[PDB]
Symmetry: C3
Subunit: 498 residues, 3 copies
Amino acid sequence: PKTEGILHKGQSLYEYLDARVLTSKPFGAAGDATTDDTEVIAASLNSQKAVTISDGVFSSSGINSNYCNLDGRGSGVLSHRSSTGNYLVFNNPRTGRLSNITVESNKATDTTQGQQVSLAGGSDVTVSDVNFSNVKGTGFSLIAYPNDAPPDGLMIKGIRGSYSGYATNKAAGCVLADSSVNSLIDNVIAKNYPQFGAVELKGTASYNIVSNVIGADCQHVTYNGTEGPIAPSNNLIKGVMANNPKYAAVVAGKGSTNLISDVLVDYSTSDARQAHGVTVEGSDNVINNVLMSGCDGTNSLGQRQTATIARFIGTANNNYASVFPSYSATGVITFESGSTRNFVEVKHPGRRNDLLSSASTIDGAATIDGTSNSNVVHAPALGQYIGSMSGRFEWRIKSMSLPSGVLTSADKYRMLGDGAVSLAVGGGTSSQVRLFTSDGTSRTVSLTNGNVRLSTSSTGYLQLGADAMTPDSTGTYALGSASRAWSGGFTQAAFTVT
Amino acid sequence: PKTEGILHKGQSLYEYLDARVLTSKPFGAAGDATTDDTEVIAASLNSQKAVTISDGVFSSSGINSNYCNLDGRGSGVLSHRSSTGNYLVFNNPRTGRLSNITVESNKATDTTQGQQVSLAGGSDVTVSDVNFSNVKGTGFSLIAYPNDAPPDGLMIKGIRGSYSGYATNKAAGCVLADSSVNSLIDNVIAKNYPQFGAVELKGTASYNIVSNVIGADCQHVTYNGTEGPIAPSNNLIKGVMANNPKYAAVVAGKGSTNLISDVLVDYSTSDARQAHGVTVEGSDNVINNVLMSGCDGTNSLGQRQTATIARFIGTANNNYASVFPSYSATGVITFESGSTRNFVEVKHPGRRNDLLSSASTIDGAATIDGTSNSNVVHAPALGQYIGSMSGRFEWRIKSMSLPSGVLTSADKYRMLGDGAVSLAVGGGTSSQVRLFTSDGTSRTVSLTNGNVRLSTSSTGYLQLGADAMTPDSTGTYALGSASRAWSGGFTQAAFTVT
Amino acid sequence: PKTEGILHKGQSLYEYLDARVLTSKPFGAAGDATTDDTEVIAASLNSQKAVTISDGVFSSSGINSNYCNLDGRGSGVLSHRSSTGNYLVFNNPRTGRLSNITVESNKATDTTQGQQVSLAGGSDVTVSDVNFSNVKGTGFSLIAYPNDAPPDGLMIKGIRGSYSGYATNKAAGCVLADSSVNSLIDNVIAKNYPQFGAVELKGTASYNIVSNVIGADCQHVTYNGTEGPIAPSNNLIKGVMANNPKYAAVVAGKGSTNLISDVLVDYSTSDARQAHGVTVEGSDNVINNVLMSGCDGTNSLGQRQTATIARFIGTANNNYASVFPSYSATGVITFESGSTRNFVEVKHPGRRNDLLSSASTIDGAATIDGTSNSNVVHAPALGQYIGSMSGRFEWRIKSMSLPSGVLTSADKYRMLGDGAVSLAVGGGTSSQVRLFTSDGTSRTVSLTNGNVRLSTSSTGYLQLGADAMTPDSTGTYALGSASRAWSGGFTQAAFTVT
Ligand SMILES: [Br-]
Ligand SMILES: [Br-]
Ligand SMILES: [Br-]
Ligand SMILES: [Br-]
Ligand SMILES: [Br-]
Ligand SMILES: [Br-]
Ligand SMILES: [Br-]
Ligand SMILES: [Br-]
Ligand SMILES: [Br-]
Ligand SMILES: [Br-]
Ligand SMILES: [Br-]
Ligand SMILES: [Br-]
């Protein structure tokens, strides 16, 4: 007997088995890692049904589909049967789901080009809990790009990728969202990827959120790149863990108004020669809470390793960074010569007591020039404020008006209030204001042994005692000169000639 | 032959199939977008088994159940057959799962009332990877509310919503958690929703986390509201992407002790007439890292557009905001007349060089009054500190005690230490302290041409030279007056009469 | 007729059913909560196929497996049949998925030891949407540990746990990652757990991300512990919701360079006697945005309750914390006496106007000593800066050199620039510099009634009028003394002897 000739609940048993019951794999697929399953799999993927490909290793060549709804139940492995070229390509899927499956490459060489999964255009596709294995050569594990509309509303979550054949600057990465909008990329763990790291945003990518990204032994962990006039802008990148990258945790790129937040990077076992926290080339980006450690001046191979927690590249401008250089290597900030209006808050200085004691702590210090183009560095724990983009520091107790034409650009420090305003200095055993100039000349108004003293020279003073004003030494200091004489004066008893 | 008359593994094949085997849709369901599938689907959802509704479009009217365990395998669509009213209503589910499915509405008009999915009470329900389509009128895509115990332990994640028929203030949103506790809302992408935006927390909602929310062209992206005396409090809202909202990225509401963190908002393509970053009406809230851009004084239609990155509404008090007004429009902060004790840190000033040069930068500046009720604004990159809630600025190098009965409210600036304490001013070519008053009177203690000068008038001075104290001009300045004469003095040689 | 004698598409119907057709539970499993299903379930889990255990309660004793691929479809409950010992133990799974299922304990006593689910070694295992029920005694709901290699690449997400039999310090928790690397723990809701709370990282745990954790009525919510010489380090912990813990929201532990961010804690209904925000014992950790409320000096039972938003334990050093003590209890920061170089920014002071008015606000205040080991506390809204690790506060308008051998350690306040540098004080009715010392002696340089006055005693002064310098009173003050006389002087008219 055959199923076509049997009834179940009054209907064809064949049809029930073929169309209604859920199966572990498509009928006719072997899943034995050797039989060519391409045709059966391609047919299933091009249907409008949910496809299950599980409980086996399915050898299959390149496949194009207009539909993406595939689940591996955590046991399906799609193993690329070809040693070159792209594997799975989804063309402009309108909604879709690719989930709970492993995609394995079998590239011929370490320079073989090919993407593992491509969303060639797409809207509202969710790729979730996918493991990319045996990743090699040039290309990406998961890439979304315009075809020709921007990818929109993607959710890429729970992605693992494992790369091999690392080389500096090699053109590969784990996840690439090229020019996507309104998309989420969350919970990614990428190992040993080169130039484009764990997550790359590219081109006109905007209004995406990238979150919870771990990159281990990658060149960069997150990377913002472009081949066009506009770079990734208006993206949120939050929660980046950089386990021993080779160059930087985060490359913020040439774009603008990105918010990057909570970046932890360790270099303790890395072969990096030029270790970076975050770099930025564009404008008006926020880089909040970069915690970097494990840079002691030497890398894992005994080579010199420089440290830079934040680098402002080229004309980078109007950016903000808050940083924690929790390491002993000298380098902390690099302001390239053309960079302007960047503000860095060193929220904890590590073991440093002064960010200016070494000229190498802040490379590019000449760009801190007190003009409207100034870069600025603060280290509040050290009470250290270096530069102001207003050309001054000013405090006021309350909103108030100032008298016209009194304060000038010379008034670089302003302590303002209404009513009585007193600046109190002291609390100890002696208290003073020291006025001084670049030539080393110094003069004080001091409270010394309980009297005011006013400096008359490098060593001399007038002392305002309770009963008399006196010079520091006798018979040497005059009141007036022949060229600058008093009009006169008033004394109850004539001055005593000593 | 029939399956009742065939054996499989020790029982009839009929019973094996009927009792054990999983299917793509319930028996009797058409999934053809036209047949009324309400009866079969209602029966399934009212069972205690895990229900699968996939590979079709299932036309169905309103359904109620006390059980919620439904999976659509990414291919099932529940298509509301009625033109009005609520669709799916789950009454007090004790645990539940709604996953991998699309819920489509089919409302008669753009003002038709109806919720798509209601959790009318519930505990430990997970709603994940659900797409809400053709959303219109008033109501919500997904709403949880007390029935009448608080919803508790919900996990709502991976939600898409697409609204049409936007109108200002229309009473609709994507996800609403009314009075829930201990719940997670994560990874939401909502398009074109009106008043209640992508995620609303409402009423006594507390102890929830809302994370990774993208709202595109919504009126507001996240919204905290209430129809009672108590508003959402003690919630964490983190990672908000506001792609061109029409009024505000985040409405923090009238509640208290919410922590809102990492908010990116762009207005570059918005028709908003009044663009806002975050608004807050309540107390003791924290609003961290609001990055706002795309406001140059006009909207997408060429109409005037105001900007306000943080707005403190009504009696809003004791709030904190850290903000990045990366835009050229003049408005930045609004303190409404009853607002008190709000502290704003402008972490990067955009292109501004002075927060006080435009009277528009801080609207409500009179509320910065230096009292215990003062609002306060700092812009550290500009070295600019506006207001203090203590009525003073005070520094100390270490913990110390001060002598009783010395400092008073006049001492609005205090630079304190033990032992020797010196305030050094200068490092250039001239250095001074300028004392001045509101009437324009200015007097200096300066280091000028290498000597101390003490101002005796607007233009006059005493010069403390190394060998003599001299007046600025000869024969015009006296030592003593008829009514205030010295007691006497001591001079080695009698004064010379010139 | 048996299915072995029937054909479906040219293959045995028996084999097609048994191998390819999915079922709700393993053949032979009762799922009736009473029948011992151990044998059948153990066999299934030890196969290399994806296992489905759903639509029932499956009574089962302890099981060991080398494979982990199990899905409960939201309706399966694994109910531990034994009253002691471990339940499910997965031994070094290489990849794995445990999902959509409930695991229930049935321990004999409130001190019975046992783990619910153990990953005894493991790589690339994902545990998702699991509910742990009836959790009791000592041990954990989900534990991962080395066997013998660190767990690597775990994804633990969407976890609920409910503990019963809470007691202070009892050795139990929800999720424990012991010595894992490169792992993600996201979206956890844990109720009533004791010592180890919702999520513990332990031992050499490094390069993990923990996010979106809700703990209700737990002793601690997140906990970093160790039984060895090295403690959890280089981890990111972000988004912690502490709904009324009994001791602390976050225990940061003895390790280093962890970044903890966005912690919301409420004590309003807690019986805690000692309420804490975050504690830390190690070094170079960052604790960002701790918002704490609900501490008024008493607990929920009316007993005394202390408050500490940040506690620096033992030799804790070089840590940073930004905090919001939004409560009325007096305690805010505790620096234990051996703690050094910790910097706290109180970003909003709540209702406090002065962090020093109560000695209880900063416990351990002697550790703010102005040395290179100093702790430091800032409260910017109050304009209050307490301590500096450099021993000074210094501002400069731009990068510049200083001539050496001019400024010394006494110059504890430095206001620097090039060219003309003026410190302007005033804007009101009178303006002054008050120099003062610890004995209460005070002297001023003031602008008073439009003239400079220089104090000569507690009450006396010299007044620099436009036409004459005069003493405050007549016939009492001398110019010079017998031992300190002028050289001479120059006057156009002889001084008038009155
Ligand atoms: Br680039
Ligand atoms: Br270096
Ligand atoms: Br180091
Ligand atoms: Br140093
Ligand atoms: Br004032
Ligand atoms: Br049989
Ligand atoms: Br409201
Ligand atoms: Br603009
Ligand atoms: Br001192
Ligand atoms: Br000057
Ligand atoms: Br410990
Ligand atoms: Br200058």
